[PDB]
């Protein structure tokens, strides 16, 4: 008789390397179904913000307008998703956008050579000002209540050092973007996570007593932080399972083929969540689980 | 010096029979990897537009570029909007006014249709002059079409070993299989 | 050491500053050589190339 209380008693978490950019927490005593559901929800369903509906006023750069628009769209912003509202998408364009459902960006860069240039110089910065166009050149000219709301939240790229385009003297670019909330599945541009995969905790089942220098070469096959040597009896043993990538290098050697079976536990998920600068991995994980809860509740409440 | 003309891209391929949408020679691209811009080849196409094809040496044509003093239909200034030619930056749909020439033979201006298949963007419109001292009114123009060819399904990709195949389906990234390191392969072959 | 190399520095330097001397990778020149040699020997010969003789 499996039950919620039994699951709660058996389930436990082990946060390993929590960071403002990356998370490496573990899930224990949970089913691959729920683990993969979380993985997929994090990768796709978790909402985020990215630029689209870009309007061009003028462009003459070598990079084409479509390429530039796509390149700008593939930028990580900083505003939290829980500050904006979805768009009905079946409205007139003037009504399609408001203060609280989108944000506006402007680039309007112009490039011209600076006469003061050292002789025999090939560096574009010295040869011409505005030689390169960076993300930080994007401004976030607000509208209406956005000025008050974003006072402590200036909309800046999560990575202002990215290279949108290169210019030349007499070369100018001027555009106008419109970032909205994304759903990830619509386009990878709306991906709050660089990658939210997981790996099952490797399991090493030592059968024979591995001793002597033969144990030392067995130690060599795995990554250094995995196998331990028992000083008491010169015995090889597992020190840290998480430290091992599934390499199967031992299987190549015939001596150890029968001495160990490289199994894998089935209820120990080593989650590893990178992120863009929009939100922290913990925040996006909580968003994912709450999204799953909302899905279940909506499915329950909608009648048949 | 082939590096000066690179073509293709390094792809994280997986020799795996997973989706089942590829048995003979089909292949599957990762949908997100496409959305990242996995391959974005574009088509540049130019055609020559002139009015002297019927003109002979000693007979200047009554028709020339531009349009005015007529009751020419409005809304042509959507993209056919200038004294002589359309704007460089525009999204030409089918049947859009490519260029307008004022004609005195009919005493009214006529335009040239797109007469193509895919909507395109104007990439470069250049003015060509006669080799002789035929100053006249420059009834010779060459324009360039930019066509964006994002890889849809059925577009033939290949490796450097004759293993050609078509894009069976843009498999969604979440449904794509992943590895221990978290990488999701972009190109799947059977 | 390494069997091959990307030569990224060389590629970027060449892209930024085209050579003002003998072009790199001469093999391409002596790959289109036959046509150029034919057309030159048409006029650049011991006596009026081949056109004057003809």
């Amino acid at each position: 008789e499996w039950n919620v209380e039994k699951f709660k008693k058996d389930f436990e978490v082990n946060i390993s390397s929590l960071d403002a950019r990356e998370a490496n927490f573990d899930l224990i005593n949970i089913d691959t179904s729920i683990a993969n559901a979380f993985r997929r929800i994090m990768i796709s369903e978790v909402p985020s913000v990215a630029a689209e509906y870009v309007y061009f006023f003028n462009n003459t750069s070598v990079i084409q307008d479509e390429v530039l628009a796509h390149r700008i769209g593939l930028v990580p912003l900083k505003v939290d998703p829980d500050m904006l509202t979805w768009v009905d998408s079946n409205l007139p364009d003037d009504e399609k956008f408001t203060d609280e459902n989108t944000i506006v960006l402007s680039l309007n860069v112009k490039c011209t050579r600076n006469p003061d240039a050292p002789k025999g110089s090939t560096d574009p910065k010295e040869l011409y000002n505005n030689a390169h166009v960076y993300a930080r050149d994007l401004k976030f000219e607000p509208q209406g209540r956005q000025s008050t709301t974003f006072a402590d939240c200036p909309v800046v790229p999560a990575d202002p050092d990215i290279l949108l385009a290169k210019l030349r003297p007499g070369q100018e670019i001027s555009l106008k973007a419109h970032c909205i909330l994304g759903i990830g599945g619509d386009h990878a541009k709306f991906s709050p996570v660089s990658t939210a995969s997981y790996r099952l905790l490797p399991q090493i089942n030592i059968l024979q007593p591995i001793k002597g220098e033969s144990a030392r070469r067995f130690q060599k096959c795995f990554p250094p932080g995995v196998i331990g040597i028992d000083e008491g009896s010169d015995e090889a043993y597992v020190k840290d399972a998480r430290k091992d990538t599934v390499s199967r290098e031992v299987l190549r050697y015939e001596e150890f083929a029968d001495k160990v079976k490289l199994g894998r536990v089935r209820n120990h998920f080593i989650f590893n969540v990178e992120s863009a600068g929009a939100m922290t991995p913990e925040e996006i994980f909580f968003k994912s689980v709450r999204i799953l809860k909302n899905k279940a509740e909506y499915l329950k409440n909608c009648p048949i | 010096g082939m590096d000066n003309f690179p073509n293709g891209f390094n792809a994280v391929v997986a020799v795996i029979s997973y989706t089942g949408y590829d048995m003979d020679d089909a292949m599957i691209i990762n949908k997100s990897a496409d959305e990242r811009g996995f391959g974005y080849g574009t088509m540049y196409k130019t055609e020559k537009v002139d009015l002297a094809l019927n003109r002979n040496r000693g007979d200047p044509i009554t028709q020339h570029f531009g349009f005015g003093n007529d009751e020419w239909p409005k809304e042509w200034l959507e993209k056919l909007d200038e004294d002589g030619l359309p704007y460089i930056g525009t999204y030409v749909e089918e049947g859009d006014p490519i260029c307008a020439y004022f004609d005195d033979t009919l005493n009214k201006t006529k335009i040239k249709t797109y007469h193509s298949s895919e909507p395109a963007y104007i990439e470069e419109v250049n003015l060509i002059g006669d080799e002789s001292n035929k100053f006249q009114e420059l009834q010779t123009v060459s324009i360039k079409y930019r066509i964006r060819r994002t890889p849809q399904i059925g577009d033939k990709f290949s490796s450097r070993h004759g293993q050609k195949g078509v894009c069976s389906r843009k498999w969604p990234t979440i449904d794509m299989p992943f590895s221990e390191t978290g990488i999701q392969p972009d190109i799947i072959i059977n | 050491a390494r069997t091959a190399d990307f030569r990224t520095l060389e590629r970027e330097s060449r892209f930024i500053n085209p050579p003002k001397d003998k072009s790199a990778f001469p093999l391409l020149q002596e790959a289109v050589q036959p046509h150029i040699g034919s057309f030159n020997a048409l006029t650049e010969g011991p006596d009026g190339g081949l056109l004057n003789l003809g």
Partner: peptide
Amino acid sequence: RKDVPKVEHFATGY
């Protein structure tokens, strides 16, 4: 014949 001369990865969270 001389053979081709030789040339002289972490888990997640490590």
